[PDB]
Design a protein around this motif. Sequence first.
Motif, PDB file in Angstrom:
ATOM      1  N   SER A 185      10.230  -5.929   9.536  1.00 20.73           N
ATOM      2  CA  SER A 185      11.083  -4.788   9.206  1.00 20.73           C
ATOM      3  C   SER A 185      10.365  -3.471   9.486  1.00 20.73           C
ATOM      4  O   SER A 185       9.405  -3.128   8.785  1.00 20.73           O
ATOM      5  CB  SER A 185      11.518  -4.857   7.742  1.00 20.73           C
ATOM      6  OG  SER A 185      12.267  -3.713   7.375  1.00 20.73           O
ATOM      7  N   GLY A 186      10.839  -2.740  10.492  1.00 15.77           N
ATOM      8  CA  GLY A 186      10.340  -1.391  10.777  1.00 15.77           C
ATOM      9  C   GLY A 186       8.835  -1.271  10.856  1.00 15.77           C
ATOM     10  O   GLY A 186       8.264  -0.294  10.353  1.00 15.77           O
ATOM     11  N   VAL A 187       8.177  -2.235  11.496  1.00 20.13           N
ATOM     12  CA  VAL A 187       6.722  -2.273  11.494  1.00 20.13           C
ATOM     13  C   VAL A 187       6.158  -1.157  12.360  1.00 20.13           C
ATOM     14  O   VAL A 187       6.609  -0.926  13.491  1.00 20.13           O
ATOM     15  CB  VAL A 187       6.238  -3.651  11.975  1.00 20.13           C
ATOM     16  CG1 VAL A 187       4.729  -3.677  12.329  1.00 20.13           C
ATOM     17  CG2 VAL A 187       6.539  -4.693  10.906  1.00 20.13           C
ATOM     18  N   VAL A 188       5.165  -0.456  11.816  1.00 22.96           N
ATOM     19  CA  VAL A 188       4.508   0.674  12.462  1.00 22.96           C
ATOM     20  C   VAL A 188       3.019   0.369  12.398  1.00 22.96           C
ATOM     21  O   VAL A 188       2.497   0.060  11.321  1.00 22.96           O
ATOM     22  CB  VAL A 188       4.825   2.015  11.767  1.00 22.96           C
ATOM     23  CG1 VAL A 188       4.033   3.177  12.392  1.00 22.96           C
ATOM     24  CG2 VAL A 188       6.316   2.305  11.817  1.00 22.96           C
ATOM     25  N   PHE A 189       2.336   0.448  13.535  1.00 28.19           N
ATOM     26  CA  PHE A 189       0.957  -0.019  13.579  1.00 28.19           C
ATOM     27  C   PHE A 189       0.202   0.683  14.695  1.00 28.19           C
ATOM     28  O   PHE A 189       0.763   0.954  15.760  1.00 28.19           O
ATOM     29  CB  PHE A 189       0.888  -1.538  13.787  1.00 28.19           C
ATOM     30  CG  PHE A 189      -0.512  -2.060  13.957  1.00 28.19           C
ATOM     31  CD1 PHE A 189      -1.352  -2.200  12.865  1.00 28.19           C
ATOM     32  CD2 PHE A 189      -0.992  -2.391  15.212  1.00 28.19           C
ATOM     33  CE1 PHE A 189      -2.641  -2.674  13.022  1.00 28.19           C
ATOM     34  CE2 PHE A 189      -2.280  -2.866  15.375  1.00 28.19           C
ATOM     35  CZ  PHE A 189      -3.105  -3.006  14.279  1.00 28.19           C
ATOM     36  N   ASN A 190      -1.060   1.002  14.420  1.00 22.00           N
ATOM     37  CA  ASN A 190      -1.943   1.662  15.368  1.00 22.00           C
ATOM     38  C   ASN A 190      -3.286   0.956  15.282  1.00 22.00           C
ATOM     39  O   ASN A 190      -3.706   0.559  14.191  1.00 22.00           O
ATOM     40  CB  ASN A 190      -2.110   3.153  15.077  1.00 22.00           C
ATOM     41  CG  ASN A 190      -0.869   3.949  15.410  1.00 22.00           C
ATOM     42  OD1 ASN A 190      -0.044   3.523  16.213  1.00 22.00           O
ATOM     43  ND2 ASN A 190      -0.757   5.138  14.834  1.00 22.00           N
ATOM     44  N   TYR A 191      -3.957   0.795  16.414  1.00 20.64           N
ATOM     45  CA  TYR A 191      -5.259   0.136  16.378  1.00 20.64           C
ATOM     46  C   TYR A 191      -6.312   1.105  15.845  1.00 20.64           C
ATOM     47  O   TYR A 191      -6.356   2.257  16.288  1.00 20.64           O
ATOM     48  CB  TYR A 191      -5.662  -0.353  17.764  1.00 20.64           C
ATOM     49  CG  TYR A 191      -5.091  -1.706  18.118  1.00 20.64           C
ATOM     50  CD1 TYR A 191      -5.550  -2.860  17.494  1.00 20.64           C
ATOM     51  CD2 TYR A 191      -4.097  -1.832  19.080  1.00 20.64           C
ATOM     52  CE1 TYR A 191      -5.031  -4.098  17.811  1.00 20.64           C
ATOM     53  CE2 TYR A 191      -3.572  -3.066  19.406  1.00 20.64           C
ATOM     54  CZ  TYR A 191      -4.042  -4.197  18.769  1.00 20.64           C
ATOM     55  OH  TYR A 191      -3.519  -5.430  19.093  1.00 20.64           O
ATOM     56  N   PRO A 199      -0.739   5.108  20.166  1.00 22.76           N
ATOM     57  CA  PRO A 199       0.120   4.197  19.408  1.00 22.76           C
ATOM     58  C   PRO A 199       0.337   2.890  20.155  1.00 22.76           C
ATOM     59  O   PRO A 199       0.137   2.799  21.369  1.00 22.76           O
ATOM     60  CB  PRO A 199       1.430   4.985  19.288  1.00 22.76           C
ATOM     61  CG  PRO A 199       1.506   5.706  20.588  1.00 22.76           C
ATOM     62  CD  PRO A 199       0.075   6.027  20.989  1.00 22.76           C
ATOM     63  N   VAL A 200       0.745   1.867  19.399  1.00 20.78           N
ATOM     64  CA  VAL A 200       1.129   0.576  19.954  1.00 20.78           C
ATOM     65  C   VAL A 200       2.539   0.176  19.528  1.00 20.78           C
ATOM     66  O   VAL A 200       3.351  -0.254  20.358  1.00 20.78           O
ATOM     67  CB  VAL A 200       0.101  -0.529  19.599  1.00 20.78           C
ATOM     68  CG1 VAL A 200      -0.107  -0.689  18.095  1.00 20.78           C
ATOM     69  CG2 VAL A 200       0.474  -1.875  20.254  1.00 20.78           C
ATOM     70  N   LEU A 201       2.855   0.308  18.233  1.00 21.96           N
ATOM     71  CA  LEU A 201       4.125  -0.179  17.705  1.00 21.96           C
ATOM     72  C   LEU A 201       4.807   0.878  16.852  1.00 21.96           C
ATOM     73  O   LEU A 201       4.176   1.495  15.990  1.00 21.96           O
ATOM     74  CB  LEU A 201       3.894  -1.424  16.838  1.00 21.96           C
ATOM     75  CG  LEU A 201       3.464  -2.758  17.453  1.00 21.96           C
ATOM     76  CD1 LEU A 201       3.558  -3.847  16.393  1.00 21.96           C
ATOM     77  CD2 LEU A 201       4.296  -3.140  18.663  1.00 21.96           C
ATOM     78  N   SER A 215       3.476  -4.927  30.277  1.00 24.63           N
ATOM     79  CA  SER A 215       2.123  -5.163  29.784  1.00 24.63           C
ATOM     80  C   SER A 215       1.790  -4.191  28.660  1.00 24.63           C
ATOM     81  O   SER A 215       2.040  -2.987  28.765  1.00 24.63           O
ATOM     82  CB  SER A 215       1.121  -5.015  30.932  1.00 24.63           C
ATOM     83  OG  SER A 215      -0.208  -5.219  30.486  1.00 24.63           O
ATOM     84  N   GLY A 216       1.222  -4.723  27.586  1.00 27.34           N
ATOM     85  CA  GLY A 216       0.895  -3.910  26.430  1.00 27.34           C
ATOM     86  C   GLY A 216       0.364  -4.791  25.323  1.00 27.34           C
ATOM     87  O   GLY A 216       0.499  -6.019  25.354  1.00 27.34           O
ATOM     88  N   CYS A 217      -0.241  -4.140  24.331  1.00 25.78           N
ATOM     89  CA  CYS A 217      -0.837  -4.851  23.208  1.00 25.78           C
ATOM     90  C   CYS A 217       0.151  -5.136  22.082  1.00 25.78           C
ATOM     91  O   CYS A 217      -0.203  -5.858  21.148  1.00 25.78           O
ATOM     92  CB  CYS A 217      -2.020  -4.051  22.648  1.00 25.78           C
ATOM     93  SG  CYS A 217      -3.477  -4.027  23.719  1.00 25.78           S
ATOM     94  N   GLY A 218       1.370  -4.595  22.148  1.00 24.84           N
ATOM     95  CA  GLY A 218       2.353  -4.829  21.098  1.00 24.84           C
ATOM     96  C   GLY A 218       2.679  -6.303  20.933  1.00 24.84           C
ATOM     97  O   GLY A 218       2.739  -6.828  19.809  1.00 24.84           O
ATOM     98  N   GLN A 252       9.796  -2.596  24.284  1.00 25.69           N
ATOM     99  CA  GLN A 252       9.313  -1.495  25.110  1.00 25.69           C
ATOM    100  C   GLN A 252       8.882  -0.418  24.126  1.00 25.69           C
ATOM    101  O   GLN A 252       9.685   0.032  23.303  1.00 25.69           O
ATOM    102  CB  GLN A 252      10.372  -0.990  26.109  1.00 25.69           C
ATOM    103  CG  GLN A 252      11.309   0.139  25.660  1.00 25.69           C
ATOM    104  CD  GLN A 252      12.251   0.581  26.761  1.00 25.69           C
ATOM    105  OE1 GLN A 252      11.963   0.417  27.945  1.00 25.69           O
ATOM    106  NE2 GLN A 252      13.378   1.168  26.373  1.00 25.69           N
ATOM    107  N   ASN A 253       7.617  -0.020  24.217  1.00 23.52           N
ATOM    108  CA  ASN A 253       7.012   1.010  23.371  1.00 23.52           C
ATOM    109  C   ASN A 253       7.318   0.781  21.890  1.00 23.52           C
ATOM    110  O   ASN A 253       7.775   1.684  21.185  1.00 23.52           O
ATOM    111  CB  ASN A 253       7.494   2.402  23.798  1.00 23.52           C
ATOM    112  CG  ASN A 253       7.062   2.777  25.204  1.00 23.52           C
ATOM    113  OD1 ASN A 253       7.877   3.236  26.004  1.00 23.52           O
ATOM    114  ND2 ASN A 253       5.778   2.614  25.504  1.00 23.52           N
TER     115      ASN A 253
END
Length: 1185
Positions: free
Chosen positions: A947-953, A960-962, A981-984, A1156-1157
């Motif tokens: 649910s609405g996940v927001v995440f940064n490494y 940003p990633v997610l 291609s991406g880390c998400g 995507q993004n």
Amino acid sequence: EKKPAVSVLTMFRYAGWLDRLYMLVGTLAAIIHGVALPLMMLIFGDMTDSFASVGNVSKNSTNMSEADKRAMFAKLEEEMTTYAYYYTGIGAGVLIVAYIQVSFWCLAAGRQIHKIRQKFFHAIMNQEIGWFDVHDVGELNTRLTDDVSKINEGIGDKIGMFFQAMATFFGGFIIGFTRGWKLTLVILAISPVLGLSAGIWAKILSSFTDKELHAYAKAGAVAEEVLAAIRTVIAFGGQKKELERYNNNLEEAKRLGIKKAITANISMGAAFLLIYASYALAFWYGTSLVISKEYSIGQVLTVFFSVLIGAFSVGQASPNIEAFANARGAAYEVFKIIDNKPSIDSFSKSGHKPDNIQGNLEFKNIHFSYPSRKEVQILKGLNLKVKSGQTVALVGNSGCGKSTTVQLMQRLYDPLDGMVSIDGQDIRTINVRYLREIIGVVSQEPVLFATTIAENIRYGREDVTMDEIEKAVKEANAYDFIMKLPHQFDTLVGERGAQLSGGQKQRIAIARALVRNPKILLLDEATSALDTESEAVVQAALDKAREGRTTIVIAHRLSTVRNADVIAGFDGGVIVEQGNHDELMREKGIYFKLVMTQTDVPPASFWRILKLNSTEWPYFVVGIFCAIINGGLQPAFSVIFSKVVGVFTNGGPPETQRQNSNLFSLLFLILGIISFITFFLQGFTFGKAGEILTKRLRYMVFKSMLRQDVSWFDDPKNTTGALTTRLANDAAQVKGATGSRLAVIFQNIANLGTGIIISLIYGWQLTLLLLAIVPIIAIAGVVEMKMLSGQALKDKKELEGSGKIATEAIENFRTVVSLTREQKFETMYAQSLQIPYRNAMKKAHVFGITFSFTQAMMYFSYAACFRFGAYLVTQQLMTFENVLLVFSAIVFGAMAVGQVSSFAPDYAKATVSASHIIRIIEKTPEIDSYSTQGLKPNMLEGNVQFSGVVFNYPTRPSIPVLQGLSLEVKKGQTLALVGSSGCGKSTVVQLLERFYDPMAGSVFLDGKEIKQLNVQWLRAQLGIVSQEPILFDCSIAENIAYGDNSRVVSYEEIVRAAKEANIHQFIDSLPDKYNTRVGDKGTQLSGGQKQRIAIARALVRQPHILLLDEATSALDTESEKVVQEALDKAREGRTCIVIAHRLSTIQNADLIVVIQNGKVKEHGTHQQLLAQKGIYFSMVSVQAG
């Protein structure tokens, strides 16, 4: 073993006549300085004779009152005028001599090095290309600055100290023998016993060293394996099983560490005993030779010292020899390269330089073998002509022959049989520089130098106007892009600067070759790596560059081949067919088949470290106790020496000189015994205290390391190697700052404390002088150790530019040799070297002085002591005995703290080495994997919900990633993740694992927040199938059982699981069936086999969720279908999340999410996402065409 070396007389070549002079004059200085202290012992003897002759007159018989005062005291005042002028004469000569010594030796060495660096680099730029083939270039480049640094040690000031120490060995055995030979031949009968006892222990310490490194190499192998495989360790919760593997190998290096810890302090107290023993034997016999009136007291005190100095002078010249032999050894590998001369001399001026070259090219019966694999021939009977102005494309099966051809026309190797000619002339009969000047090489990859565009281009021909540069950049098609760069022709490129694309780099190389304006062009893999976009512009610029030039192109793209004037087909060194494109197509041979396939500053408190060893305080009490006794035996010796000499210098009857002398003489062996006992117990208590401390801290560390969360192991600094280091040597180096530091400070206190007290009471006037000057000489001994290192920083930092030039030139040698700019880099090197030269020529001026004024402030102060003490005996305020009890209680005790402190480990390096340990232990993670709390219900549904996940490494917090990532996976369905291609995509797998927390939003599992459930019971029902599966050095049973830990894994459960992973049948025909060692030690498995093992482990766990992350990361065609069958098996009726790269995986999935993004652009079944005609449609359309 026999490592080679250079003949001594060779190694000093490149030494000019002035260097031959400097080494001589500097030697004469070194000899003088060598004998200068033996004279201080001779005088010190005649000084005690001058005191002894009167010291007993004024005491024993009271004959006259004042006609005895002025007589004897005006005799001493005139004797000591001479002894003080003598001492100062020494310190004056020292001040001059020591300067000349280190001045002239460091000078001649520097002058020789500067002549070596240039000749050695030039020697490397003069080598062949087959010479570079065999050698490792990395060690060669370090060999330019390490081996030259190993020679500069063994030709500099290290010789002046050697001839000094030998001039004392002979000056001392001279004074000893010529003033009395009985005492000397007594000592030299014992000195083999001590040189033997000394050498024995260095053979036993080196024994228990390497035995120790082979004891820990078992534990440190498990260490390296874990911390590389930590993702699997956390994902399968084996964080305790690996702690036990790492620990059950950790007792070996402990017991061995004790057999080293004891025997080191045995070696100490053992030789410390044999000093107090041969002291007694030499003083008991020396007293028996003055009682009988053969020697005086001054004779003995001369000879015993002037022997012990010259005898100890060997141990001080041991390393100055070893450094001179290290210099011989490093000088052999270098002088070999300098004395090696090539067949193809890139500097010679021999061959013809023919003008008006049309480029007729001819290969005649060429045979060739590379000299790294000389058994296989590369080309056999190769014959072929290129007519002037024609283009030749080389095609044929994979092989080094085509590039070999290009290397032979450069003349980078010399063919064995046959002959290569240009316009009828043997290419081995013109000059190499003219040859390569007429040839432009376009390599596969272009080397750009870290300089400006103007300079990178000018490397092709350094005498060129900026107009001609502009013309070439135009012609090469790189001009318009350069004009759009911010510093147009001045922009800085290379590794330091802005990265250019492949196409732009190659076009720069083309412009450079245009500047060279050669008559022949050679291009190899010109557009191989380049993409079609870059390839079109490069092809246009190459085609431009080729017009009316003789060209050989190693063609990979068909379009290059189609416009060529002639095609050669090569197979196994042999031209099977030659002709135009249409001819070879008609032939329907090799070429046709081709065309019809391609279409660090933490401060730690001292007490904090000390607390770590607090669990073993009883060891510490004892070690402190013996550190006080052993710290007290020194001022005792200062007494027993003074009380000895007092008898023979103040007054006494010859009835007591026997019992007093013999008593104190055997009090030496009382002290010597107490030394050996207090050392055997000091090193039995502080020894175990340390070897315990290592083992207990390695355990607490490795535990705390597997407790850490994944953000820590993602850092660049906590790589698996710097953690094995920190876990291996830094964990052990602490013990030099816990017990060894108490042993130091308790020895030093018990030494300088009781000796300050004693010397203060026996006479305080001399002491306040000495303890006022000891601050000065101790400072001097410090500042030498400092400025010796701070100058090492200065000179070796100014050397990095000079070394970076060489690094740039060796690391791209094949390029520069083709540009023939070996001379340019030679000049650039020398010009960079002109700073550390003039600096070194002032350096010898400096260290001449710091060495001179250390010895001058020491020889002068010897007079400033034995003058002041003498005036204290003139005024009948103190005795000569009490003088010796001050002098050898301050000096011989202050030397004692040095002989202790210089033995013990480096305390600063140990403290920071420990502060890192405390940080790695006291760190508490965001994700306590070890914890025991959490819900852990009995609900096996497995509803997954983002649910609405927001995440940064946190390693890359700026990116940003997610963003707003929401998605459900219903029980038992398979979800495929797709997108660019991406880390998400990987991140979803890492978040369900809970390798990281999210910044905002929520991840739920059956309605429950995963941040509220035990990490072990989250991850126990999650199966991770990694990209590159990690197999452990271990049996199949253990590697599979590694998953479900603390679980009765039996033969039954292995076999059902191995069936369902599809590996049972393949396993059962292997030789040891299930006991077969896998890993690095055992049979290497292919990529496909390893993943199938990982699958069997995931089936054994029998989780309700399966996480599959970019499996099939291999090219094994059969393995792929085996894996895919096993995967369809493994997913069935299980909740599955797949990171999908293959379309077929996507087709059969129950649900697809297009990301995507961070954003779910679309989702649905396969058919609905196709018919949507969106993003997913774009992916499948690209593969479809």
